[PDB]
């Protein structure tokens, strides 16, 4: 068959949940069409009103911008998993690139002070 993936998802026509549906699922699809019809009729009324001169204030786009900008720290709860993974992702590569930079520069300073590394034509350092 065709195996699903989180990055290559199952299509809804090949989905097994589209073929064994219930009247409560069909009522959910009718209510989804009803709420899309209500939102589309409100948007189309605000589209074709000639008294409107400004733009369309999109409330869900304002909601998404507010949730991505100024809701994350009011909705923080300090958990040990978030604290450990944030401490690793905010501290770990600083000690890792500290070890890389200090090892490479200790090697370079040792080879310069011992004379093995030669700057042959190195005028602008």
């Amino acid at each position: 068959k065709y195996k699903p993936a989180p990055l290559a998802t199952l299509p809804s026509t090949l989905d097994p949940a589209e073929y064994d549906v219930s009247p409560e699922t069909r009522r959910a699809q009718v209510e989804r069409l009803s709420i899309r019809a209500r939102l589309k009729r409100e948007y189309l009324l605000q589209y074709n009103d000639p008294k409107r001169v400004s733009h369309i204030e999109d409330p869900a786009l304002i909601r998404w911008t507010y949730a991505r900008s100024a809701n994350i720290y009011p909705n923080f709860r300090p958990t040990p998993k978030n604290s450990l993974l944030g401490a690793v992702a905010g501290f770990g590569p600083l000690i890792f690139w500290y070890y890389v930079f200090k090892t490479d520069r200790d090697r370079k300073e040792r080879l310069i002070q011992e004379g093995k590394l030669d700057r042959k034509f190195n005028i602008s350092y």
Binding site: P16, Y19, D20, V21, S22, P23, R26, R27, V30
Partner: protein, 149 residues
């Protein structure tokens, strides 16, 4: 057998009983029952079996007169669908030590109806056989589990 169907097919539609639990009996109203009747009592999922004493042209004339046009088309084109149920090998053990006799079942997932090997799994199951304590065969019974028992 209901505990074995609960613990063999957990998370599937085969986990539930045919009777239903006591918290689900008390909320069954009329409209849920007629929704079940309008969904699962559809005509091509129904057969009319007669056995002997009948004539088939008489039965088809009577089925044209009576059992024709039951229901064929669904409500919102919402077809029911059979799913392959997961077999989970598990253990349930209801311990009642004051109860006299222990009923213990052990079952493996077999191939089912439409797979053609129900005859060979049934002939293995019939070599193993059955015993009850009222059977007067005794030690000389052919099935060796019953003979050892």
């Amino acid at each position: 057998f209901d505990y074995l169907h609960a613990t063999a097919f957990q998370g599937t539609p085969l986990a539930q009983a045919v009777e239903g639990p006591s918290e689900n009996v008390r909320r069954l109203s009329r409209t849920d029952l007629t929704d079940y009747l309008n969904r699962h009592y559809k005509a091509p999922r129904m057969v009319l079996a007669a056995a002997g004493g009948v004539e088939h042209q008489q039965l088809l004339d009577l089925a044209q007169k009576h059992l024709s046009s039951v229901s064929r088309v669904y409500e919102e084109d919402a077809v029911p669908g059979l799913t392959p149920c997961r077999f989970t090998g598990s253990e349930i053990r209801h311990r009642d030590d004051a109860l006299p006799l222990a009923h213990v079942a052990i079952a493996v997932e077999g191939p089912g109806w439409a797979n053609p090997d129900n005859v060979t799994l049934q002939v293995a199951n019939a070599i193993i056989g059955h015993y009850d304590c009222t059977y007067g065969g005794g030690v000389h019974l052919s099935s060796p589990l019953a003979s050892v028992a």
